[PDB]
């Protein structure tokens, strides 16, 4: 009773296909045609943070837009004061291969993770003045690729075992389990109201999730290769994904389609990181060819290039007030642009 | 007015940097190795959670070997974490399924990855005793073995069969065919023959890591 189920799935796919095709009456290019361009966007590197011994995989800003954490595979989480280029903490880890780092919006906690299959929470606000491990979350069967805080007690993780998970930090137990991907999940992005999040795995698919009930709401296809980065639009009604096929793409949640593609013939390297600006007009993307291209979101134009790294750009992040952007790379340097 | 809350930050940065200067010296004095192998390759034998660490020490040199335990058989996203390693220790069951060809395909993918272009491979061609035991009691899966002649630069063991010598050197040449087709002087391959009982494997890895460090230092002077 297998081919009949597959033909039912096929006719459901066809119904979804033409139900999406009936909604595309015009293109985003047709509508933002007469909008004025943004011009050449020139940025300057304002700080270069030094101190990591090996390549940087992850970084995350604090919600005060002054502090940022970074993770390097020499086994250190270094917290920085971006305004004064001073180190506030240097946390040694029990596993060298860290691949994700998260900053809690309260500012009290930091979470790292990697090939140890464990999400370790750290407490930056202690009595003895020592940053110690609060809890180590076990239960994933593959490596951790992404982790994002929701409160001081909840955290969502992404693993290489094709699963996302919701955790309850005070009990250490996995509450909700998000299944559905057929390849390893690489990135997460939370919605601005923390009721939804979207994941991008190495099966050329993006999926929307309900944090409350644990159900998949929508699935988005269109990329040809593995998705490596997802970011939400600042209003929560759209998101952007970067892949190994050298294209970023914009999706809507109410139209269930793709609205724009951002590609050039001179770009043949994959995309590592994706971030929007505060207005949502600029899309910043880090590439494997050591650069970072700025895009116009409502159009498909390059507004500028952030050049200055000497190895693969690994992580991007725009502050909560949009004042600056931070880039890390395998040259073991962090650069802040403005 | 606010300078009292800036000298504290400067003192904290002083202390952090004075610790990081010790971390840098303990980091650069250690050589990290990735122990990779296929199924039934005897990898856990020559070893003598997602990652299994194992530290050893040869002539006051600290080594740090790593083995992937819990990960799936996808590898294209977590093998990129293993640049900056001194070498990749690759183990093959050199003896149901054509697992020798699976090992050749994995080696071809590792040697030709955009990010592994600078990492060297120490090839441990394992199970030579079983290879002899089987060739005493192959060209069906490798047609070019009917044309293969033993290299006259061979270094056989005393009293050994000219059959098992030819078989083992055929497999070594199958791997060197991939190793020599690319590289352009960026990374090197070190093939070895390891049996069931070999204490010399740690010494072999030591000598090969020494060679890699020497060649990197020479390339920094544009001498090679």
């Amino acid at each position: 009773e297998l081919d009949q189920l597959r033909q039912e799935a096929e006719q459901l796919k066809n119904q979804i296909r033409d139900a999406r095709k009936a909604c595309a009456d015009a293109t985003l290019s047709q509508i933002t045609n007469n909008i004025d361009p943004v011009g050449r966007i020139q940025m300057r590197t304002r700080r270069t943070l030094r101190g990591h011994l090996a390549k940087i995989y992850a970084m995350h800003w604090g919600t005060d837009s002054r502090l940022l954490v970074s993770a390097s595979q020499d086994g250190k989480l270094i917290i920085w004061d971006s305004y004064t280029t001073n180190k506030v903490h240097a946390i040694p880890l029990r596993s060298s291969w860290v691949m994700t780092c998260a900053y809690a919006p309260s500012g009290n906690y930091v979470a790292c993770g990697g090939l140890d299959n464990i999400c370790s929470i750290y407490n930056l606000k202690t009595r003895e003045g020592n940053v110690r491990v609060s809890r180590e979350l076990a239960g994933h069967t593959g490596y951790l690729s992404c982790c994002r805080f929701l409160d001081d007690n909840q955290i969502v993780t992404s693993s290489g075992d094709t699963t996302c998970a919701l955790w309850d930090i005070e009990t250490g137990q996995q509450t909700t389990t998000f299944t559905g991907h057929t390849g390893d999940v690489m990135s997460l992005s939370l919605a601005p109201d923390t009721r939804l999040f979207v994941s991008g795995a190495c099966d050329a698919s993006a999926k929307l999730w309900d944090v409350r009930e644990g159900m998949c709401r929508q699935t988005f296809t269109g990329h040809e290769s593995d998705i490596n980065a997802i970011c939400f639009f600042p209003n929560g009604n759209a998101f952007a994904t970067g892949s190994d096929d050298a294209t970023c793409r914009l999706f809507d949640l109410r139209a269930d389609q793709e609205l724009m593609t951002y590609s050039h013939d001179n770009i043949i390297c994959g995309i590592t990181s994706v971030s929007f600006s505060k207005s949502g007009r600029l899309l910043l993307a880090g590439y494997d060819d050591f650069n970072c291209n700025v895009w116009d979101a409502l159009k498909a134009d390059r507004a500028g290039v952030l050049a200055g790294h000497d190895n693969r750009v690994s992580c991007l992040g725009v502050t909560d007030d949009g004042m600056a952007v931070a880039t890390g790379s395998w040259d073991s340097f962090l650069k802040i642009w403005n | 007015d606010q300078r009292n809350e800036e000298k504290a930050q400067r003192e904290a940065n002083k202390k952090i940097e004075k610790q990081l200067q010790k971390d840098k010296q303990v980091y650069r004095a250690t050589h990290r190795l990735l122990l990779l192998g296929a199924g039934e390759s005897g990898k856990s034998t020559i070893v003598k959670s997602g990652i299994f660490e194992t530290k050893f020490q040869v002539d006051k040199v600290n080594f740090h070997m790593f083995d992937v335990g819990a990960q799936r058989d996808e590898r294209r996203k977590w093998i990129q974490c293993f640049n900056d390693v001194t070498a990749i220790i690759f183990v093959v069951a050199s003896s149901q399924t054509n697992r020798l060809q699976a090992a050749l395909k994995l080696f071809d993918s590792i040697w030709n990855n955009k990010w592994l272009r600078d990492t060297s491979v120490i090839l441990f061609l394992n199970k030579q005793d079983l290879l002899a035991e089987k060739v005493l009691a192959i060209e069906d899966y490798f047609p070019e073995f009917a044309r293969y002649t033993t290299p006259e630069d061979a270094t056989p063991e005393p009293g050994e069969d000219p059959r098992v010598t030819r078989a083992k050197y055929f497999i070594r040449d199958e791997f060197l065919r991939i190793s020599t087709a690319s590289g352009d002087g960026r990374h090197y391959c070190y093939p070895h023959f390891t049996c069931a009982v070999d204490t010399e494997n740690i010494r072999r890895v030591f000598n090969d890591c020494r060679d890699i460090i020497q060649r990197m230092h020479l390339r920094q002077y544009e001498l090679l």
Partner: nanobody
Framework: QVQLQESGGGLVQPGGSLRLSCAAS????????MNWVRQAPGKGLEWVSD????????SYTGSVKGRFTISRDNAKNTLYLQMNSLKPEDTAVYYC?????????????????????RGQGTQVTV
């Protein structure tokens, strides 16, 4: 969507010949190296042959050399395997697989149990 559709399987009394086709929609077929992988009953996934972006570099496993020919047609988005002089040990489900990344020479995990860029396969029986 990245979709691969095979056809051309069936029954061949030993010694005959078959042609397998693979229709590919959902990606730029010219930027990708393609593969042919099979699964014998009670066995794992094995690698049969591969072909580059342009059909310049071609490789086969030793058990099929001189008997199979892989070929592309980058214009009509199709891939072929001409199975000539079939032995009774060639019975397997044959899958059309794609390397995961454009403009690359390495293909890591085509013979994995859960690989996304691979069709449902066709069953040839000798």
């Amino acid at each position: 969507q990245v979709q691969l559709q095979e056809s051309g399987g069936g029954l061949v009394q030993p010694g005959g010949s078959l042609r397998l086709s693979c229709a590919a929609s959902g990606f730029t077929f010219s930027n990708y190296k393609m593969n042919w992988v099979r699964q014998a009953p009670g066995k794992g996934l094995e690698w049969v042959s591969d072909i580059s972006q342009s059909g310049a570099s071609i490789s086969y496993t030793g058990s099929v050399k001189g008997r199979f020919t892989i070929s592309r047609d980058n214009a009509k988005n199709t891939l072929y395997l001409q199975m000539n002089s079939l032995k009774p040990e060639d019975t397997a489900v044959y899958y059309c697989a794609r390397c995961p990344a454009p403009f690359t020479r390495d293909c890591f995990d085509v013979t994995s149990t859960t690989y996304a860029y691979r069709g449902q396969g066709t069953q040839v029986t000798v």
